[PDB]
Design a protein around this ligand. Sequence first.
Ligand SMILES: O=C(O)[C@@H](O)[C@H](O)[C@H](O)COP(=O)(O)O
Ligand SMILES: O=C(O)[C@@H](O)[C@H](O)[C@H](O)COP(=O)(O)O
Ligand SMILES: Oc1cccc2nccnc12
Ligand SMILES: Oc1cccc2nccnc12
Lengths: 550, 550
Amino acid sequence: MASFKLATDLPEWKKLEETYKSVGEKFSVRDAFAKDPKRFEEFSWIYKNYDDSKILFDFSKNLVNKEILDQLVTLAKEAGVEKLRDAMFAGDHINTTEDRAVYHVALRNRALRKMPVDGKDTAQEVDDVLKHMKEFSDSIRDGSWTGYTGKSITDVVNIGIGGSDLGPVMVTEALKAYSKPGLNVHFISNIDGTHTAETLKNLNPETTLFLIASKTFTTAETITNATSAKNWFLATAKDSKHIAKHFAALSTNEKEVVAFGIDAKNMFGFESWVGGRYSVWSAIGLSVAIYIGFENFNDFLKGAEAMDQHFLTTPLENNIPVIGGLLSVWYNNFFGAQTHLVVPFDQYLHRFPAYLQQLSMESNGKSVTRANVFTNYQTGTILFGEPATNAQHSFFQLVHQGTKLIPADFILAAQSHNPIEKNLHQRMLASNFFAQSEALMVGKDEAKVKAEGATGGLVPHKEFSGNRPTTSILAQKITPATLGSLIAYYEHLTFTEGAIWNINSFDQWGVELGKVLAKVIGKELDDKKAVATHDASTNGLINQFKEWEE
Amino acid sequence: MASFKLATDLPEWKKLEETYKSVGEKFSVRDAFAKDPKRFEEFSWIYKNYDDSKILFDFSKNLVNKEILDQLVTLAKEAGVEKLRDAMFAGDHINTTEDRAVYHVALRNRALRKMPVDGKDTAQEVDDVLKHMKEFSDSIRDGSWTGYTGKSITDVVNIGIGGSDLGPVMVTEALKAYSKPGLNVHFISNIDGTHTAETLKNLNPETTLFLIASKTFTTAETITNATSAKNWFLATAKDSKHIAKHFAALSTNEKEVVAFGIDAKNMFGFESWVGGRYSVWSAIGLSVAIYIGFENFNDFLKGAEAMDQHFLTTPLENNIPVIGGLLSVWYNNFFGAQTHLVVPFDQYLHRFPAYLQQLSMESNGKSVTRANVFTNYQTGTILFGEPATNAQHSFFQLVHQGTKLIPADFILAAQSHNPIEKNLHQRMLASNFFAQSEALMVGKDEAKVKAEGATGGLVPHKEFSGNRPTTSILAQKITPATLGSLIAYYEHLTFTEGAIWNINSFDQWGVELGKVLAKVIGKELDDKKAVATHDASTNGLINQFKEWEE
Ligand SMILES: O=C(O)[C@@H](O)[C@H](O)[C@H](O)COP(=O)(O)O
Ligand SMILES: O=C(O)[C@@H](O)[C@H](O)[C@H](O)COP(=O)(O)O
Ligand SMILES: Oc1cccc2nccnc12
Ligand SMILES: Oc1cccc2nccnc12
C-alpha cells in the first residue's frame, strides 16, 4: 500500500511551485555559470563501471541550481523513492495491479547475490538459463549446431513484437561492431505480411534459425508470424521432424511452446516478473548472445548490474539516475514541457531513442496512482529522438528556435569502433556534440545578429534565445558494458519519475487491451458484407475497406 | 509584406478561445455521433488521384464539429491562407528571410503548366533535368552504364544529409516493392565514421555508383563523406579518370561540383527555390528513380501534382490538407497538445514518421512572424511515430492511458504488396487499424471495468477515458502515386499551419547555424591541450574528451 495518494500531497511539491515562479521560469544558465565558478564540477558526475571504464554525466546546462536540486531531492525523500526502490530489489510485488514482483535487476545478478521472489532466491534459476544461452549460442557460433541438411547456421531470425523485439533490435544494432562476418541477425515483428516476406526472401531454410520470442507465447502477431515462418521452413524442409534444429523459443509458457511444436530442450525460460520493456537482459536477449557472443552479452549484463548497484547504494543527491529523473519531473510538471529528446551522436545507437521511447512511455503513461485514485497532474513525458549529426539538419531547427521547451540528452563516445582516417570523422562528430549543447545554452542575441550583418526586419529571425537545456553524457567507448549501464540508467530514471508521480511504472493495461481489441473486427473481415455494429466512423472505414480490399 | 502581425490579432482567434472553453475542452466524440447521424459523411473526404485511385481521409473521430470547423475555416480566411498559397504557386519570393521563391510544386509540374520564377517559366528547365534523370537511371538499370572494369552497376550509394538524405531513404523504403533483385540502394549521411565503414564494407568499387547529394555542395559532413568514398574507390581503382563512371552529383552549385572532381555531364541540377525538406521531387530523388525506375518516380511526382491541384482549387471547407492543418492548430493552440503522432499501419512506411518529423518541425519550429515580431503563442508541434502494429505494444500505452492529449494520424492501405497466406496477415493488420481508433474514441468506463471482473482499487487502473482523437487515412494501395499524394498532403498541411501562425515555413536559421558552429571546436580538437575558451561545461566536456580519446 501507498504512503501518500498524489504527488501534489507531498509538501515539497508546492514549495517547488513557488521556486519555479521565483527562480525557475526565468532561469539563466549563463548567469548560473557566472555566479558559480564550480558549477560544472557540482552538476556533473563520473560513473565508474565494474570494468573501471567511465561515463561522464554532465547536467550543468540544465535549468537547475543548488536550491532547486536540493528541493527536488527533498521531494524524492517525501515520495519514498528509496523505500520503493529497496522493495523492488527485495523482490516485493510492487507491480500492484498484476500482483507481480519487478525483478529485471535479478536478470543481471552475475555476482549471484541472494535475490528472492516469494522468499526463494532467484540467482541459480537465472544463472541456469544464462548457462543454457551460453551453451546454445556457442554452438551456433562455432558451427557445431547444424541444420537439417548438416550445414552451419548463417542467419538467425527473431520473431516477436514490442518488448520481445525492440531490445534485440536496438542492442544488436548498437553492438554490431562486435559481430562476425557470415553470422547475421534479422527480425520479424509486424503482423504486416511485408515484414515476413521481405525478411525471408533471400534466406535459406537449411541455414536459418528462428527464435520465437514471446513472454506469453499467445500474442496474435507473434504466433501468426511464427506459423508463417514454420510454413516457409516446411515448404523446403518438408518433414516436421526437422523443426527441432531450426526453431527455439524464448518464453515463460512451456505448455504453449510445446503445443506449438517446439522442443522443450529448445526453450529458454524466464519469469512473470520480467516486464517486456525490461526483458532484453533475459532469455529474450538470446539473439544478442548469438550475434556478438555470450561473453559480450554477459559484459552487457554486468554493466547493468554495476548501474543497479550505483542506484541502490548512492545517496539521492549524488545518485545519477535519480538526478536525471528529478530533472524530468521539474521540466514535465513545473515548466510544462511535454517531451524529452534523446540524441545519440552515434550511428550504431540509431534505434536507442525508439527503445527508450518504449521503456519510458509504456512505463509512465499512466493516470492512476498506487493509492488507486486518478492523478491531477502530468505523468509520463513523450520521448523521441534520432541520431546526430542528422538530427541537427532537421528537427533541431525547432529545438533551437521554436516555442516549445524540449529537454534533451546528448550521448557521445570518446572512442569510435570505426576510427577511419586517423579519427578525422570522429573529431568532427565530437565537435558537433560540444558545439550544439553550447549553442542551445548561449543563444545569439539581437546585438550579435546585427554585428553579424543583419538589418531591419531580418534581425529577429536570426536570434536564438539560449537557455535551452541539455544533458551531455560522454562515454569512453560504447562497449557492451557501457551500453548495459546506459540502459540501466534510463531504467532507473524511469523508476524515479514513476515513484514521484506515485504511479505503477510496471503494468500496461493499454497494451494489454490492444491485444484483445482486434479479434471482433477480424471476424467481421471474413466476408464482404457491410457492417453496422460500431460507431459510424468505424463502420464507414470497415465498409470502405471491404469495397477496396482484394 | 504581411497583412497582419500575430495570429492572436485575427478576430476569430479569440472567438475560438471562447468556443474552446464552452464546447471544445470537454468535447464528447461519442455524443457528437449520437447527435449527428451523418457525422462520418460530413467529416470524411474521398480524395481522387490523377490515376482514378482513391484515398479516404476520415477526420470524424477528432474533437471537432460544424461550429468548430466553420470557425477554423474563418480563421484561415482571416489569415490569408489562400493569398499566401496562391503567391507560392505564382513563384513569389514568399521565403522572405532568404528572398527566395518556394517552388517544390514546380518540380512535379508534369502537366507543363506555366510556373514562373522571376517572370521566367520553370517548366522546361525542370523537365530537362527529369529527362536527364530518366536517361541516366534507365542506363544504370539496363546495364548499359558500366563501371571502370566494364561491369554493370549493382549498388547505388547516396551520400548526403538532412533534406539530401531522408527523402531518398524514406521513399526507397516505402516503394521497395517496386525495386528489382540485384540493384540495391544504400545511404551514407552521418559524419560518424561508422556510417561510411559499415555501408562500404561489403561493396565492390567496380560495381558501385555514388550520388553526392548536396544543394550547396559545401556541407561539411557530405563533402567529408564524399571524400572518404572517393578514397575508398581509388584504393581499388587507382586512377582518377575512373571517377567519371562512378560519381554523380545532385546539386545547385556546378562550380563546387566540378572543383570536387565530378564531371558536369554527371551533374543533376536544381534551383535555390527547392528547400531540402521539400527536395525529394527534384534531382535529389535520383536514387529513387534508379531503384524503382523513372516511370514509377514520375507517377510519384504526378501524385504530388494531383494533390497540389486539390490544394490550389478547392474551397477551404472541403480542402483536405487545409482541414488537417486547421485541426493541428486547434489542438496545438487551444488544447495545448504539444505533439502530433503519425502511425503507418505499413512496414514499408517505417521511415515515414521520421521524414514528416523533418518536414513539419523544421518548417514550423519558428518564433518570428512575417511581420518580423516575436510570437506570443505556440507554433510548430513535435511530430513523432513508429509503425503499427509494433507501436500498439509500446508507447500506445501512454496514448491510451496517459495524461497528454496526442492527436494521431493512422494510415492503412486496403491492399498489400505482400498479400501472403491469401491476405491472412493483411486482414489482421487492418482489424488493428480499425479497432485502435475505435478504442481511443470509445474508452472503457468504470461500470464496464467492473462488469469485466475488476473490484476495489484495481478498477481505475483499467479504465480508459475515450475521446482521444484520431484521423484515419485509408488508401487503396501504397503505389508511387499514392505516396506522392500523401507527402504532398503533409506538405500543404504544414503550409496551412505556418500561414495561420504567420511564420515563414521555408527558412531554417537554426540548421543554418548548426552548419557553422562546429568549426571552432573542431580546430581545438587538433591537439590534447586543455581548453578554457568556452563556458565551464563546454570546457569540461572537451577536456574530458581529450583525456579519453584514442
Ligand atoms: O511491453 C509489452 O508488454 C508488450 O510490448 C509485449 O512485449 C508484446 O505484446 C509481446 O508480448 P509477448 O512477449 O507476451 O508475446
Ligand atoms: O533542411 C535542410 O536545409 C538541411 O537538412 C540540408 O538538407 C542539409 O544541411 C544538407 O544541406 P545540402 O543539401 O546543402 O548539403
Ligand atoms: O506464406 C509465406 C510465408 C513466408 C514467406 C512468404 N514470402 C512470400 C509469400 N508468401 C510467404
Ligand atoms: O578510410 C575509409 C574509407 C571508406 C571505408 C573505410 N572502411 C574502413 C576503414 N576505413 C575506411
